[PDB]
Design a protein around this ligand. Sequence first.
Ligand SMILES: *Cc1ccc(-n2ccnc2-c2ccc(F)cc2F)cc1Br
Ligand SMILES: *Cc1ccc(-n2ccnc2-c2ccc(F)cc2F)cc1Br
Ligand SMILES: [Ca+2]
Ligand SMILES: [Ca+2]
Ligand SMILES: [Cl-]
Ligand SMILES: [Cl-]
Lengths: 8, 8, 232, 232
Amino acid sequence: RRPSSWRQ
Amino acid sequence: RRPSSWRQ
Amino acid sequence: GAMGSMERASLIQKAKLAEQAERYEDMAAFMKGAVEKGEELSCEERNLLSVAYKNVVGGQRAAWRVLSSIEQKSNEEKGPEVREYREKVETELQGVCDTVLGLLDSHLIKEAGDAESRVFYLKMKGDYYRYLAEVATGDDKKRIIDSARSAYQEAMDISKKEMPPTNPIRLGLALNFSVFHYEIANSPEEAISLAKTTFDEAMADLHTLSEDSYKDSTLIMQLLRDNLTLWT
Amino acid sequence: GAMGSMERASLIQKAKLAEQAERYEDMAAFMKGAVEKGEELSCEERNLLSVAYKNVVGGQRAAWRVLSSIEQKSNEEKGPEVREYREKVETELQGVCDTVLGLLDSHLIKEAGDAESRVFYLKMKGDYYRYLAEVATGDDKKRIIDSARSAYQEAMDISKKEMPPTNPIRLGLALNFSVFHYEIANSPEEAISLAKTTFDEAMADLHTLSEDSYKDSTLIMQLLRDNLTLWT
Ligand SMILES: *Cc1ccc(-n2ccnc2-c2ccc(F)cc2F)cc1Br
Ligand SMILES: *Cc1ccc(-n2ccnc2-c2ccc(F)cc2F)cc1Br
Ligand SMILES: [Ca+2]
Ligand SMILES: [Ca+2]
Ligand SMILES: [Cl-]
Ligand SMILES: [Cl-]
């Protein structure tokens, strides 16, 4: 899967 | 709640 | 038109791509271009047109209801911003409805010879007048409501004469006409009677269907059942 | 500008309304108008700007990845439509990134005096160059990548000197810089080292925080942990 960047 | 109309 | 230079088949292909990308505004623009080529639409193409604009206007309706609820709570003096933005979203919604109704009037409905296509487009016409009626407050509100009713009613008359009771476009038409009765015309008993009669007569026709047609019809029957459980 | 006639406070109010209505394109247009009033942005206003454009470009990136995957499968001759539509979405994405970078360059970054605001805008600059790098294939791809790196690196230097290790904008900056290392710069070991060091030094600073600050910091630490579990 794709990694997590900042999300609200 | 609101009723169901046609949805795909 | 902005899509006048693109091939009809390319517009169809790109509409399917936009659906996969969940780009429903692009999808609607592509199908509008396809319709404006002047040729009739196949069953698959009619569904692409329907799905595209239903998604566009569905997001506008949901946004309008959020803003309308905030506006009602504010009026229970704090600035014009809430009304202004609700009016902005409202005007954009009406523009999309007017665009779809224009495609139906020029010239999808008049060229629909078969019962299947004509009922499809008349159900579309009823739906988008219903969406216009959801936000209407002016001198022409009753005429907007009757325009929805008149389109639904002609489609109903054709579907009862030319289609079996399990036909998916006949079922979807009756479902949406019943929602019109309940939410727009303030006729819950007519809404309930239509949904029940439609469900029962479809139930009695299921025995004639293949497994694939059975799945299609029972899907829409379940929506009729959901409303009947909500309304009774 | 199209928003030049609306009050700054009205644009902020309508941006919050658009967020509630999930109308993120409207939200971004409102905050662009607010930025173009020429005054600095508060913490809350900076977050509104960030959330609006992250949602807009997030939908464009997701659509671009869908179309790029279809395009790659097609090249493994069937018409130019897939490439054309991928290029269309790509160009729209680049336009939004260019718009955000223009707001940062004129003149958000140069007027950001405090470490908190300057790190915020430099992290934004790194993010949107990273989004440009995700679709870049031309002569300037390496310069786009280094522009992202340079903005992230300046923000990192400021955050390490001026902020505690649990500061949410410092944590989010390190998270996104690590994603840059892994996905863009092809430096997984640097990505892993940054995420681990950031997590550990934040963990050791939690004891100084209130319950509300603790919740904010541990939220972002969990994102660092998720990537470390994905990468190791
Ligand atoms: C309004 C509506 C009701 C039913 C369906 N439906 C369900 C399964 N197939 C279809 C369909 C597709 C295309 C078409 F021209 C007619 C039709 F009934 C679709 C809609 Br829209
Ligand atoms: C990129 C990013 C990381 C963290 C946060 N964040 C989380 C909780 N509050 C905040 C926040 C809000 C506003 C602001 F100016 C700075 C800040 F850290 C938000 C973002 Br965007
Ligand atoms: Ca042609
Ligand atoms: Ca003013
Ligand atoms: Cl407005
Ligand atoms: Cl295109």
